Symmetry: C5
Subunit: 324 residues, 5 copies
């Protein structure tokens, strides 16, 4: 039973060098706030109890079941699920006692996406590997990350990868932090361009005379089209607790503007049916509406240029597990 026990480095804790290869980051689900990735962990340590004389055994390296010798069990706190692609990994031990273990795992880990500037948003995703069964006085970690992502043509691109060992911890752990940027043009072309086109179409349709019967139907059909587009957007974009994306607010403002234009058109047409004052009011409202649309565009551009989110840290983030 002593073989299964963690090797004793002496007064200092045992040092395990971890090399992390990020094979891919495939699913990035903003709706579920989850990021899916594939990792290869190479864990290397020294176990002098496993060292053998080369004269007795000619082999320079052997393979042993992971349940025979001591292997540090790693658990990811943020991972919704972990799938280890090896049922029973085999640890490779050199003649000097160096033990190297290779683990391939696909993990769906929780990531806090800052979706305020969607679609051009940047987020930080953290994968914290914890050795729950061990203590900091017994185990120490050196984590190195190697960028080996096999796919680059995706909506989200990882552009910064790093590893850190947080100080003042009781449970030994290492955190791999990556930065995700969204470069997908699907959302923009899908929603923003049709929305701007519909808004400009409504602005130009405001030129139609009040007495024309084709103006009301035109405006209402545009309103229905924008209602469909807004429904698609809101069903597509996730809703945060504190910092919702600016796009939903922008589309809500545009929807209210289109509704206001349609209601004004219908009300003034009805009043005129019962240059009269409805026509002058319609012209004044058209000028005011064009000015307001331009002002709304400029104000939202300024907001997008200078918006900030002071999202309060979650209890897990503010007070992480296994510290002090």
């Amino acid at each position: 039973q002593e073989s299964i026990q963690i090797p004793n480095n002496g007064s200092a804790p045992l040092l395990v060098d971890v090399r992390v290869f990020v094979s891919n980051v495939f699913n990035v689900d903003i709706l579920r706030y989850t990021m899916s990735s594939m990792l290869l962990l190479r864990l290397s340590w020294l176990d002098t109890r496993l060292a053998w004389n080369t004269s007795a055994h000619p082999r320079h390296a052997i393979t042993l079941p992971w349940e025979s010798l001591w292997t540090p069990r790693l658990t990811i706190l943020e991972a919704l699920w972990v799938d280890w692609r090896d049922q029973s990994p085999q640890a490779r031990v050199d003649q000097d006692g160096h033990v190297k273990l290779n683990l391939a795992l696909a993990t769906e880990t929780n990531c806090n996406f800052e979706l305020l500037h969607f679609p051009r948003d940047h987020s930080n995703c953290s994968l914290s590997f914890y050795a729950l069964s061990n203590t900091a006085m017994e185990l120490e970690f050196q984590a190195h990350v190697v960028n080996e992502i096999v796919s680059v043509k995706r909506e989200y691109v990882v552009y910064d990868l790093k590893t850190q060992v947080p100080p003042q911890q009781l449970v030994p752990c290492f955190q791999v932090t990556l930065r995700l940027k969204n470069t997908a043009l699907k959302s923009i072309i899908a929603l923003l361009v049709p929305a701007e086109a519909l808004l400009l179409a409504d602005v130009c349709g405001g030129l139609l005379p009040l007495r024309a019967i084709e103006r009301i139907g035109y405006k209402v059909t545009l309103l229905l089209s924008y209602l469909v587009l807004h429904s698609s957007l809101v069903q597509a974009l996730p809703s945060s607790s504190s910092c919702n994306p600016l796009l939903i607010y922008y589309f809500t403002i545009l929807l209210l503007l289109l509704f206001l234009s349609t209601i004004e058109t219908v009300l003034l047409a009805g009043l005129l049916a019962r240059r009269s004052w409805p026509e002058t009011a319609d012209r004044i409202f058209f000028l005011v509406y064009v000015v307001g649309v331009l002002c709304t565009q400029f104000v939202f551009a300024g907001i997008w240029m200078w918006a900030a989110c002071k999202s309060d840290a979650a209890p897990g983030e503010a007070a992480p597990h296994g510290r002090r």
Copy 2:
């Protein structure tokens, strides 16, 4: 085989201290009435049979397979599925016999959502860990919960967490109760604002004269838009057996109001085609319809302020498993 047996505390049952860390609550599916969460359970007890003299073994703590020594098997009744993120957990035993076991598990547990006040609804979710293979006279539980949720920017926010050991039980168990509040603005902006806008647009379109050919098409297009919106809402909101959400009733009432307005407009236009009495009837109905819309808004606001649901407890809730 005696090692696998539960330790004997004597006349009193063995005491196990359970510390629960809620890492995240990620999926909250109202349609399926399920809540998905990640938990870390630290179970600590005393096993004097495992105590060893420090002189014989210099190690101050050892790690053993969970199938070697006695580990209490915990089963969650409400959990649709449980995924233990460790294939074979390792129990850490101190020199004095104290055994500590760390279990990381992702569970999809049944939660009874009170959806009457959707979207601003509060619900209670309970996770009941049961030691089915043991009896109350043999095992006792002390459950402590620590709020370590890593994500706060989600639709549902946990704002109250507690643990309890129900009295007069035959199967030892402990229940973790959490409170879920919905702070998502996606539903409101998606549905309520377009619905109110369409209702006000129909009210203002009632101003159009009966003889106008543009009024019927306007009202029917608005009716189609609200039909699409109502279909989206009803396909989005789940249906409870007894207390359905107030939103579906509100949207049904608004849909009936819009249908009544359209049918009145069409009928009176047809009668007029065959100040005449259809025009006076149209004006009277317009006044009555505006008054009725305002009254419906006020009555539903009052209902929302003072609605209650005396939802009868389920047989599992009224008569919980393993009691007396």
Copy 3:
């Protein structure tokens, strides 16, 4: 190897008492004809070989791995998948040899839904636990069901639960039969109310004069709305091989009625464009159409009150596995 063998009761087969607790019935998928449930099975039998003298062993009860002593392996024929929430269950054995085993399992079992009277339909769901590896002369079952469902606020409510041991069987098995009733108002409000409203709107729009240009557009927009609603319904309702739901036939009849009204309106308007006879024909058709709509409503109400389905039993139902 004799311990793993089934205990010998003598000439009579061994008797196993099974207590079934239905924790929840969560997914009821009519489209897939599957019902998902969670069950707790307490299996109790007598094994005199495991009995021990209390003088030798002070323990009054012990726990053993399920692979050490004989445990009856239960297989569900109708279950699409079974998930046993315990990797290795532990059997509790008393000093007298009584063995009790607790198994928690989540099962997706096939259920034959009688969807003729959707949404107010009642169905029978059967879960047949079979001991395939054993014979009837060796194993006997006593099955008891306890209603411990934890959620009652769902679309489908279980209102009758029972257990039975079919006679003249070769493979020992026990069947848990439950009755599912649908109390969801989502389908009704979603589909029936808009359908009736659109039908009545078309009936009232038949009042519009033939020469009016607003009648054709009104009827066609209503037709498009009902086409969308009918598409939503047919994509929502499953299609049985023999007894399809009455709702799809009702909506098809209403869709044909609306198409007939629109085609008549367009044809007579075109003929009139080229009191004339088209107007008299339009009035006669309007009267006939109102009468036909009322007659269709009454006839379908009578059919719903007196419809029956003599659905032929499936080969598995007519000839169940392991009989004679």
Copy 4:
């Protein structure tokens, strides 16, 4: 280690009798070309090494772990995934050495659907169980199929089941072939009836005069409705590599016909706006369009009655695994 080895029948290979019970065929996904089924395999063979004298052991039958004695491992080539509903099956051995093993498995197997005549299409689904670890000179199979399907009220009904052992094979295998017929009326009512109704409505709307302003809007609204219906159909029907369903071609032809009618109406109305020749051309085109619609209906009916698909066999079908 000799117990695990396959029993020696002598010069002839060992004979294993396989009885297959098809409990259900639940998912039949045309889009993924996969069919999901549940099977119970009873494998019986003779192992004289396991025979015991009744005098020494009074038991007439024993149960052994499947990893103790030789059990043929069966692999399905077409199965996307297999789920064995028993973690560790137990083999029942009689006193004479007869070994019977019961395996319950849910499999998602690839099936080549002939979707040319959708929805009234017939397909052949094959499940090939292979003993990869064994050779034909060592193992032989006798496969019998019993129709025990528990659900008959589904879209696809199995009406023919058979088993075969292909000749001239090196890897012992047996193939269960079943015939699937689609009896679902959901697709027909959902798509064909609305399509025919819209086509006839457009034909009747061709009666409207060219100078009428209501004709263009009518035709365009019908065109939009048929566009929505065609989009729903094409997103519903899968696309084969060589033999696509006739329904998509039929709906494409109808969509082109409706577009041609709308374009002709708009062009001639515009030319007339600038009995004149546009009116005579419109009447001639109306007659030609009615004749063409009738001819298209008759030609497609004849094609449906006499269409054939000589789909080239896949490399796996033409050259099956483990032959010669």
Copy 5:
């Protein structure tokens, strides 16, 4: 423990011959950039330690558990998940020491799809099997691929399969490269034909006079139809980081063209309402719009004929794992 060790070929590394049978390629998800396949790997090597004299053991071949003798553990870097359809594979060893192992596995592997020419696009999918626990000086691979795909009637057809052992590698691995071509007509008929039909309909509707009230509604309804179609396309097509499909750009250009036509029509109609110059401007714009539509068609055809994508290789592709 020496049996589990890799056999020693001497100075040269041990040679393992791998035969790969591709049973099927079923899911090809462009949105997730993943390809799902089923493979059968036959791994053959020589282990003289397992050779036995035929005089002692009459058997010419034996079967052993994969955990008894040395079996090379293969890991796929690009595979999102791997499902080995055998819980415990059995290795067949001949009398001369030749060991053959058959592994059936269903894998979802990452594939970089070149979607620039969608739907008629060709892509390369690579499956890299790595022996992480071994070194190149100890293990060598010979990989052979056999095309045994059981389904050919799918959207994506594999038309080229090959195997390669990359040179200058430290971790022994072999790569199976296949070529995927899309032959599905679902996308074309679904989107391109309706888009071209709507564009030509708008072009022909430009013939309508400016003063006509039916022109604006016609153009706006066509615009709404194309908006729905464009939304369906963009929600259907995935978005790459660098080389988006040409279809989304084409549909965006067509949508902008339709919006420009509608805005011009509405603006000039409004100006005319307030041969006049609006009519001459409308005719000139109609000619310019027809010319521009034809020019856009020709330019996009030329682009499609001569477009190229120099997609930069991903860090995993440029620097593959286990080299030098």
